[PDB]
Amino acid sequence: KQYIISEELISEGKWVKLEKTTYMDPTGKTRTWESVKRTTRKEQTADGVAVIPVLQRTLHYECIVLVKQFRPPMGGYCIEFPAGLIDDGETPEAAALRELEEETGYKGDIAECSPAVCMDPGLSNCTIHIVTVTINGDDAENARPKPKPGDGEFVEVISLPKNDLLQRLDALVAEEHLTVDARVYSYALALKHA
Amino acid sequence: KQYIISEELISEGKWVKLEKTTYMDPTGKTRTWESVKRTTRKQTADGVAVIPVLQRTLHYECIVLVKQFRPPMGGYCIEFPAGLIDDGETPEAAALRELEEETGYKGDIAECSPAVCMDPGLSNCTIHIVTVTINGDDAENARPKPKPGDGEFVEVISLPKNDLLQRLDALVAEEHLTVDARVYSYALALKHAN
Numbered sequence: 015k016q017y018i019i020s021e022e023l024i025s026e027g028k029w030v031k032l033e034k035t036t037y038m039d040p041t042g043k044t045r046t047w048e049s050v051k052r053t054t055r056k057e058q059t060a061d062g063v064a065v066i067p068v069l070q071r072t073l074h075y076e077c078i079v080l081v082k083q084f085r086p087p088m089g090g091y092c093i094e095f096p097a098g099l100i101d102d103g104e105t106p107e108a109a110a111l112r113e114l115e116e117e118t119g120y121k122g123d124i125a126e127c128s129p130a131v132c133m134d135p136g137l138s139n140c141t142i143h144i145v146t147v148t149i150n151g152d153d154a155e156n157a158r159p160k161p162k163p164g165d166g167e168f169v170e171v172i173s174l175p176k177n178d179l180l181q182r183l184d185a186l187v188a189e190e191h192l193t194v195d196a197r198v199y200s201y202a203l204a205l206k207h208a
Numbered sequence: 209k210q211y212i213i214s215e216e217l218i219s220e221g222k223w224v225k226l227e228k229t230t231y232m233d234p235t236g237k238t239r240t241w242e243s244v245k246r247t248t249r250k251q252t253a254d255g256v257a258v259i260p261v262l263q264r265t266l267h268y269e270c271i272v273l274v275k276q277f278r279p280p281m282g283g284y285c286i287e288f289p290a291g292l293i294d295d296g297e298t299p300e301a302a303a304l305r306e307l308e309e310e311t312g313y314k315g316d317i318a319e320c321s322p323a324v325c326m327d328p329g330l331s332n333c334t335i336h337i338v339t340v341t342i343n344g345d346d347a348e349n350a351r352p353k354p355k356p357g358d359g360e361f362v363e364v365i366s367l368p369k370n371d372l373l374q375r376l377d378a379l380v381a382e383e384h385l386t387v388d389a390r391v392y393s394y395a396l397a398l399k400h401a402n
C-alpha cells in the first residue's frame with residue numbers, strides 16, 4: 015500500500031544520478047527520500063553480476079575465488095566477489111562468466127543464478143544477479159589463468175579455502191588496510207554458522 | 209600504488225552527496241570516478257545489519273528478516289534488520305536497538321564484523337554485520353513489541369535457517385519482492401556449506 019508518486023532528477027553524472035523520491039506512506043501521507051541510481055541500466059534485469067566462483071580441484075579443498083581492487087568511492091583496496099555491470103543485451107550468466115574470466119582468468123561453469131537482489135535499498139535502486147559458478151581447476155584452461163583487465167582495471171586474485179573463509183579474511187584484514195565486502199562477509203559468516 | 213588525489217562535490221542533499229573523485233591509477237595515469245557518500249557519518253561505519261538467529265526449543269532455528277517499502281527501489285524488499293549508527297553509539301548497541309525497534313526481539317551479541325563495504329564501486333557506505341541470538345523461549349520475546357521510529361513501517365518475516373534460500377526464492381516468485389544481496393549471500397552459503 016506504499017508506491018512512488020514522483021522521481022525528480024537533482025544531479026545527473028555520466029555514471030550516477032541523485033533523485034528526490036516522492037512516495038505514499040501506509041498512513042496515506044506523502045513523504046520524500048533521496049535516491050541514488052545508475053545512468054547505465056537499459057533493459058537489464060539488474061545493473062550488474064557478482065560471481066561466487068568455487069575453484070574445485072582433485073585433492074584440494076574447494077576455494078572461493080575473490081578479487082582485491084582499489085575502489086575510488088572507498089578511497090582504498092576492497093576484497094570482493096568478481097563483479098561487473100551487465101552489457102546491453104548480455105544475459106546475467108554471460109556477464110558473470112565474462113567478468114570472472116576478465117578479472118581472474120578462470121573459465122567457470124554456470125551452477126545457479128539468483129533473481130535480481132538489491133545492493134543497498136535504503137540508498138540506491140542498484141541490483142545484481144549473484145551467479146554461482148564452479149571452476150574446474152584440473153582443466154588445462156584453468157592451469158595458469160591470466161586476468162584480462164580492461165582499460166583502468168587493476169585486479170589481484172585471492173583464492174581462499176571455503177572451509178576456513180571467515181578466519182582467512184580476518185587474517186587478511188588484520189595484516190593491512192582493506193575492507194571486505196558485505197556480501198563476501200555474509201557468505202563467510204553463513205559457512206561458519208552452517 | 210593507487211590513492212585519492214582530490215574529491216570535488218557535485219551535489220549534496222540532506223542524506224546523500226555525489227562527488228567526483230580524482231585518483232592515481234597504478235600506471236601513474238590520473239583518472240576520475242563518480243562516488244556516492246552519506247552526509248550522516250560522524251562512527252566505525254554508517255550502519256549495522258543484524259543477523260538475528262531466533263532459537264526456540266523443538267522448533268527449527270529461524271533467521272528473522274524485515275519487509276519494508278524502499279523508495280529508491282520503488283518496491284518492497286526483504287532485508288536483515290538494519291539502521292544507521294547514532295553518533296556516540298557502538299555498533300553492538302546499534303544492533304540490539306535496531307533489532308528491538310524493527311522486530312520487537314531482545315537479543316544477545318554472538319559476534320560483530322569489522323566495517324564491511326555495501327557497494328564499493330558506487331559508494332563509501334559501510335556497515336557492521338552483527339550476529340545476534342534470540343532466546344525465543346524467554347518471556348521478553350513471547351509477544352515481541354516492534355518500536356517504529358518516525359516513518360518506519362516494517363513487517364517481520366522469520367524463515368527457517370535450514371531452508372532459507374528455497375524460502376526466499378518462493379517469496380520472490382509469489383510476493384514480487386526484492387531480496388537483499390547480503391540476505392541472499394548468507395542463504396547461498398548455508399546451502400554451499402554442504
Ligand SMILES: N#Cc1c(C(F)(F)F)cn2ccnc2c1Cl
Pocket residue numbers: 046047048049136137223224292359
Ligand atoms: N527519513 C528519512 C531518510 C533516511 C533515514 F531513514 F535514515 F532516516 C535516510 N535517507 C537516505 C536518503 N533519504 C533518506 C531519508 Cl529521507
Ligand SMILES: N#Cc1c(C(F)(F)F)cn2ccnc2c1Cl
Pocket residue numbers: 029030099166240241242243329330
Ligand atoms: N570508467 C568508469 C566508471 C565505471 C565503470 F567501470 F563501470 F566503467 C563505473 N562507475 C561508477 C561511477 N563512476 C564510474 C566510472 Cl568513472
Ligand SMILES: [Cl-]
Pocket residue numbers: 207261318339341
Ligand atoms: Cl549463531
Ligand SMILES: [Mg+2]
Pocket residue numbers: 096097098113117
Ligand atoms: Mg569488476
Ligand SMILES: [Mg+2]
Pocket residue numbers: 097098113116117167
Ligand atoms: Mg570487470
Ligand SMILES: [Mg+2]
Pocket residue numbers: 289290291310
Ligand atoms: Mg532499518
Ligand SMILES: [Mg+2]
Pocket residue numbers: 290291306309310357360
Ligand atoms: Mg529502526
